[PDB]
Amino acid sequence: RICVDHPYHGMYHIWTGARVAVSRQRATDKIAKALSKNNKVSSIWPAIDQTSRVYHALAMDRDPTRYKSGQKVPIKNSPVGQNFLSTMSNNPIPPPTLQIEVSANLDYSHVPMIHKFAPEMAIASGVSAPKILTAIGTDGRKYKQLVKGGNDDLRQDAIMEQVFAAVSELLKLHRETRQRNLGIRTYKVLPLTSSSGLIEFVSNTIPLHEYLMPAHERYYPKDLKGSQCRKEIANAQTKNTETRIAVYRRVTERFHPVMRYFFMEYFPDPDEWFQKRTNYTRTTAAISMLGHVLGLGDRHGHNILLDHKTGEVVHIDLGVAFEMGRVLPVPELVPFRLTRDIVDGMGITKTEGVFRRCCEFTLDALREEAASIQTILDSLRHDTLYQWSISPVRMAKLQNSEADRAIEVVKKKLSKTLSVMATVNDLINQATSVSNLAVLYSGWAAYA
Amino acid sequence: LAGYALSSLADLRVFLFKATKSKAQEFHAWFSKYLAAYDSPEFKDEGQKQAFRSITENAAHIRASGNAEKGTHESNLLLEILKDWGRENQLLNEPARDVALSMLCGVFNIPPSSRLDVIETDEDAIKNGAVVWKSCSSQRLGGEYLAWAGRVLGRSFAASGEVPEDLLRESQLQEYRRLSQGVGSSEEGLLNLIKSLTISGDCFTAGLAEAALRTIVSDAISDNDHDLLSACQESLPEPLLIASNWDPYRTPEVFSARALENPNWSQHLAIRLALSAPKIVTLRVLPPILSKVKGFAERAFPFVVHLVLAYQLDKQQSAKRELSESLQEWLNFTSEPAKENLKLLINTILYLRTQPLPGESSIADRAHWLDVNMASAAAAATRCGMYKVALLFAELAAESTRSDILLEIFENIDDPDAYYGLSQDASLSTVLARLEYENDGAKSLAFRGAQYDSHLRGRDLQSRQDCNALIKALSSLGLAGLSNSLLQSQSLDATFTTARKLEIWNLPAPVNSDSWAVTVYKAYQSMYQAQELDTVRSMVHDGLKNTVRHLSSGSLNTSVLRQQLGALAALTELDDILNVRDQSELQCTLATFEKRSKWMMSGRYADV
Amino acid sequence: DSHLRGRDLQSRQDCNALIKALSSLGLAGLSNSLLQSQSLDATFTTARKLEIWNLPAPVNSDSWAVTVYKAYQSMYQAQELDTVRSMVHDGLKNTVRHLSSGSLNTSVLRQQLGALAALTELDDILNVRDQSELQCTLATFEKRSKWMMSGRYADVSQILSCRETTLSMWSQRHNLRAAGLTSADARLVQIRGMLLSSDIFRFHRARQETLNLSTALSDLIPSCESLGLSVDAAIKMEAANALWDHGEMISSIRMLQAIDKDSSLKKQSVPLSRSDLLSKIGYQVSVARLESPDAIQKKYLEPALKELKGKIEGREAGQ
Numbered sequence A: 001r002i003c004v005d006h007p008y009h010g011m012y013h014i015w016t017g018a019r020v021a022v023s024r025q026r027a028t029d030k031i032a033k034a035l036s037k038n039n040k041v042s043s044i045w046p047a048i049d050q051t052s053r054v055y056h057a058l059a060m061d062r063d064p065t066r067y068k069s070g071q072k073v074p075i076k077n078s079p080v081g082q083n084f085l086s087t088m089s090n091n092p093i094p095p096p097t098l099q100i101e102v103s104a105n106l107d108y109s110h111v112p113m114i115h116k117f118a119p120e121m122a123i124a125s126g127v128s129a130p131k132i133l134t135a136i137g138t139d140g141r142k143y144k145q146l147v148k149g150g151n152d153d154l155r156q157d158a159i160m161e162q163v164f165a166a167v168s169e170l171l172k173l174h175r176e177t178r179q180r181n182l183g184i185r186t187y188k189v190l191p192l193t194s195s196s197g198l199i200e201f202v203s204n205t206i207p208l209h210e211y212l213m214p215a216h217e218r219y220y221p222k223d224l225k226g227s228q229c230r231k232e233i234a235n236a237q238t239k240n241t242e243t244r245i246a247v248y249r250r251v252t253e254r255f256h257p258v259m260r261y262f263f264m265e266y267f268p269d270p271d272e273w274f275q276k277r278t279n280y281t282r283t284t285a286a287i288s289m290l291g292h293v294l295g296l297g298d299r300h301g302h303n304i305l306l307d308h309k310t311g312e313v314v315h316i317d318l319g320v321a322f323e324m325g326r327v328l329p330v331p332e333l334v335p336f337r338l339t340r341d342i343v344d345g346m347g348i349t350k351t352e353g354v355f356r357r358c359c360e361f362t363l364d365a366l367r368e369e370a371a372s373i374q375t376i377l378d379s380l381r382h383d384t385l386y387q388w389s390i391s392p393v394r395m396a397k398l399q400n401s402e403a404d405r406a407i408e409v410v411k412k413k414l415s416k417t418l419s420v421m422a423t424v425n426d427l428i429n430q431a432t433s434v435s436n437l438a439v440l441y442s443g444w445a446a447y448a
Numbered sequence B: 001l002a003g004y005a006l007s008s009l010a011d012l013r014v015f016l017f018k019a020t021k022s023k024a025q026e027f028h029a030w031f032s033k034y035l036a037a038y039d040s041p042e043f044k045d046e047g048q049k050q051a052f053r054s055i056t057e058n059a060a061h062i063r064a065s066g067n068a069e070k071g072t073h074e075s076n077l078l079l080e081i082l083k084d085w086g087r088e089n090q091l092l093n094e095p096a097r098d099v100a101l102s103m104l105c106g107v108f109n110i111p112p113s114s115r116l117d118v119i120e121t122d123e124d125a126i127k128n129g130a131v132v133w134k135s136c137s138s139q140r141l142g143g144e145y146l147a148w149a150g151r152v153l154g155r156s157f158a159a160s161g162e163v164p165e166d167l168l169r170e171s172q173l174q175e176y177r178r179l180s181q182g183v184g185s186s187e188e189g190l191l192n193l194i195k196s197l198t199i200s201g202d203c204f205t206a207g208l209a210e211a212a213l214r215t216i217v218s219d220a221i222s223d224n225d226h227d228l229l230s231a232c233q234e235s236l237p238e239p240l241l242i243a244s245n246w247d248p249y250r251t252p253e254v255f256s257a258r259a260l261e262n263p264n265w266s267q268h269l270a271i272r273l274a275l276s277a278p279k280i281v282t283l284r285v286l287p288p289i290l291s292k293v294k295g296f297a298e299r300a301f302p303f304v305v306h307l308v309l310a311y312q313l314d315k316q317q318s319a320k321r322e323l324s325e326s327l328q329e330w331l332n333f334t335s336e337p338a339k340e341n342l343k344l345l346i347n348t349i350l351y352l353r354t355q356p357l358p359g360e361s362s363i364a365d366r367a368h369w370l371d372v373n374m375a376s377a378a379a380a381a382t383r384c385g386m387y388k389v390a391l392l393f394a395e396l397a398a399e400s401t402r403s404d405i406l407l408e409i410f411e412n413i414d415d416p417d418a419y420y421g422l423s424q425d426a427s428l429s430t431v432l433a434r435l436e437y438e439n440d441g442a443k444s445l446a447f448r449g450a451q452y453d454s455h456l457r458g459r460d461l462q463s464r465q466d467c468n469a470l471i472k473a474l475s476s477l478g479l480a481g482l483s484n485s486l487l488q489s490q491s492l493d494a495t496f497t498t499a500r501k502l503e504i505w506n507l508p509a510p511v512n513s514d515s516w517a518v519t520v521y522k523a524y525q526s527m528y529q530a531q532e533l534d535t536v537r538s539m540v541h542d543g544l545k546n547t548v549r550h551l552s553s554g555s556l557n558t559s560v561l562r563q564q565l566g567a568l569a570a571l572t573e574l575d576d577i578l579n580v581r582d583q584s585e586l587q588c589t590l591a592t593f594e595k596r597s598k599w600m601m602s603g604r605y606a607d608v
Numbered sequence C: 001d002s003h004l005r006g007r008d009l010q011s012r013q014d015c016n017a018l019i020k021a022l023s024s025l026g027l028a029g030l031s032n033s034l035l036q037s038q039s040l041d042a043t044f045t046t047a048r049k050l051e052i053w054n055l056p057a058p059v060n061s062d063s064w065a066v067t068v069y070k071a072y073q074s075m076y077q078a079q080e081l082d083t084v085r086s087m088v089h090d091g092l093k094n095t096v097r098h099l100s101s102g103s104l105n106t107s108v109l110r111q112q113l114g115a116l117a118a119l120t121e122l123d124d125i126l127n128v129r130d131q132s133e134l135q136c137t138l139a140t141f142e143k144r145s146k147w148m149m150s151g152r153y154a155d156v157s158q159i160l161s162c163r164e165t166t167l168s169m170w171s172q173r174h175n176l177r178a179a180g181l182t183s184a185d186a187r188l189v190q191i192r193g194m195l196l197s198s199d200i201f202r203f204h205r206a207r208q209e210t211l212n213l214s215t216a217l218s219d220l221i222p223s224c225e226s227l228g229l230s231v232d233a234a235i236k237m238e239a240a241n242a243l244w245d246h247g248e249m250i251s252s253i254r255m256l257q258a259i260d261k262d263s264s265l266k267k268q269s270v271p272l273s274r275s276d277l278l279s280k281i282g283y284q285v286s287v288a289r290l291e292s293p294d295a296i297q298k299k300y301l302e303p304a305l306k307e308l309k310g311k312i313e314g315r316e317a318g319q
């Protein structure tokens, strides 16, 4: 009944389930056969069927010669590309990465369908080339998409994106966090198979590392490059803590933050500048507290996007949660990312003022909703397919009862024993400590 | 044709000796028939075609004055003009719209009730509030039009709790970016400024502007200047771009202090700068326009400064040296007659920060246009009430280094949390200052009572100020009787807020006061001392008019601004309940209160 | 408010109640303004706290506030100690005659006994002749503090407020003092009595009284530096204690660190050791988590043990 009333919210789950795992597959196959039999959803299920087949075929198709990392190839020179374009013309659907709100009136006609595809697609650097498609909708907007193939696990990312969105919705029920619009920015992950997915390409952002590494040499031509800092930190990785801390101090004495310019060169008007810098500080505070409470890790510069229209940060790739990150070979022993460049963008009063007050308001509202967060994590506990450890496949892809333990850690981070002021003080002390930042992995660019 | 028709029909309707009048009437009839029969493929959409039809038809039948009643011709015309003003592809232009508005709104007629009003719903008011504020920022508007504009702004604020964004901007960078559009150069900005003089001047001004444009476009066509050609082809429409070309034929002390105080500093300095660069054809045709036209020098100052500085970049940098030496004296200038030129200096510095220097690596080199001491500029912008500009300058200064002005910035900038990031030495007094900034309740009453006792006992002279603070605190709580007793022992807002809360309707209210509490108090007092609803309506309308006139006065911080908007909202709700006629209207007023509660749950606490 | 707005007749009684409330707090200026807008105890308690010595006191009144007020007023308007002794003795006599009158509840009874105690402390400090007697009076105050820590709050607050008035009036009236008692001595003894009362009021969790005392002490620093006294460190530490007990942790820590940075804790009457200051800063920084526990030990605790200077006995080293 859910898939019949709200097809764009249930039919991709049914498709993934069909195309104790054998029993689940059989039941979802029966539901799919029944869906392609009734009159309400009979022109929607075949469209999703054919379209998902061609999206998956396009995802799996990796050819190092035909798909060169960094280029921009017109998607008609492969047979997969032409089959994809034909099938997508013959079957109209909404863009699979568009977030559709649920309609109480049960009317999903006002939803933009895919009109056409831009002729070309970009390609990113990797082994299984992630391709960035663009779809022009009926209303004339551009929906970009990563068509991700390989052996990754997007269901972890999708589950955690849903959990984070639910907790941020909890934040709207309190006067102090609602007055400041404290919340997180969401995106859409859609797992197609156990090896492929569609990720929503967030519209007009730029990765934090792609801004920071050119800016460091543009504004300080006498400083070290970013690669030189990374190499100097990686060479002293198998040495005692004293040598690591000494090398880290030596490297950050020749590397100065440049984040304060992001706002001076995208917003030259002081009114806009002030508003966008406040947006940056507030969204950073909210995601810092929320990711401390849920153990969010893997917070390097390629998982953080800067929105250069509104100034706020977007966190993607949210799959390493519940402290899975301090089990890695070189552990991540910081509560959140608060390097010198993150703090440089906050202004002349570095962490005092907006950041610390918004951290305190967020944490105070979170530990007043510990029952609802317990309910959300309990719903997570009855999910058969969610893994509470990090399988060595992704653990090797990252650095070159488990439910009960995790939920108990979360529950004791929300305890009212200490005050919010003291808790936030301790968190900001251990997030900016040079003895904690010096022993982080080199790909987690802490010097930056 | 839309603007010409509107202006012509308006001036005829005002103009309507016997034979001349009959000829004018026959022309009016012929012209209205022509316009009714007019139809063009050049209409952007069909919305523009219906707007054209409505404007022309309603203008053809207006009276001498304007009103706001629902269904007349004058109110339909006013609503069309306002709806057209806020758009992207607008039919009218500034001179025609100004003529129409000075005809309609010169002598106005505000409806008694609000059920007979052309704007009566909260949604109409939210939609049209920005344009109605943009309109009531002239000088040729009657009192009843300002009362009507206050009613619309008050209904918009009571329905949304949001300030129109024209009241919140503090720099002119938006206008400089609207002018220098298409390419983004100062030449396009000057060309737009000069082009706007052809359609909006008298004979003399339009003649000067047409002469300037002819010189510029001809000397750009002959000399094959591609930059200036690209500026002209995007600043001027084609008919004006063709009438400016002599195709066969041939074309027929300031730099010192105390000069910031005469009201013609900008004009003299602009002429002095533009004369120093004869090779630029756009600056050569300026001194006539700068000297004749009024208010042109202030609008054109940044473009002139930038053009001169960019011209003599590789040559001997004379204007840079002179301006950067004078700025050391101009920025440290505390004066009332000099504030309005200091604003223009700050806006010029801001504008130069957005222009790329030729041969630059980063934006950190745009600090080389002039040589500004950013601490002095921050202090100057704090004196002028531009606190976000002051914060930006303070940050640039701090970068130049690698705190007495930062306190004045953070006390007044509009953010809940920024003030708490400033570091200041600790004491009971500083904690009290933070608690009174924070508007705490009993927590500041404790510290203030301790100070006040200690100052009364020691016969200190600060106790007076202490009492003041206490009264302020006791009004932020709701304890009105205590603040009344503290006032009777010897502010204005406190006096009249307390009198209204306790319902003491016999205070002699001052006349011509800038306090919102006095305005609201006079309305309620008149409601107490009156036997006819007409006296009360007159007092409410005088309150709305005076409040709008005070909002237009300019230099207000954000707290005072929102207090005035809340006074407008209060007077509008008073006027709404004074005009109920039956039970259904009473229930509709109650339902309106409920919807506004929906907005109020999340809004700022002072306004609510 | 609701009774003033509705022109109700109960507002009078409301005002009465309010004045009573505003005297149980310590907010004397507010109750003064509420009285001038038109009780007896409230009138004369407020007049004594604000030091308004020109009220015409009724004669033959059963109020303790009037008795104590007349004694202090006579202390203000007199050039000879004999007139003041006569007024104090008349007060004691009348108070005993009123206690003997019979029908008194327990609150009025204890108010009268506290009036007797106040008049006795006044008489004690009026009769000091040298420095040894001044130090003996201060030691008496300390022993009574030992009893006061656990006693009933009404009696303790009454006695302590009257003691504050006594010490300040004695410090002001230069002709009532003996020969060899300079103004620096009177000022120093007033400061010490106030700091003692602040300890007592702190144990009772009386926030407004510690606030009142620390404000009134901070106002004495200008007129203490002209008499040749160094009492800024103890008075600023009392201010920091008031802040900490109202919940302002960072303000208190910053204030104590300012005391430690720029102040000479050696040349200081009302002494203050550097190790107890350092350990106080360390404790407050640990409670607020303001620094990492590795800098707390490096900046505040090991410096404190080093400031002890080999002494391993006493209460300072114990702390």
Ligand SMILES: Nc1ncnc2c1ncn2[C@@H]1O[C@H](COP(=O)(O)OP(=O)(O)OP(O)(O)=S)[C@@H](O)[C@H]1O
Pocket (backbone or CB within 6 Å): A124, A125, A126, A130, A146, A187, A199, A200, A201, A202, A205, A207, A210, A301, A302, A303, A304, A305, A316
């Ligand atoms: N949903 C998204 N929207 C916008 N940009 C994205 C999105 N996902 C990834 N990116 C960025 O696009 C690029 C693609 O990176 P990916 O191939 O997804 O993984 P990666 O992080 O770059 O590489 P590693 O090996 O995982 S560190 C990176 O610069 C990402 O920051």
Ligand SMILES: [Mg+2]
Pocket (backbone or CB within 6 Å): A302, A303, A317
């Ligand atoms: Mg990634």
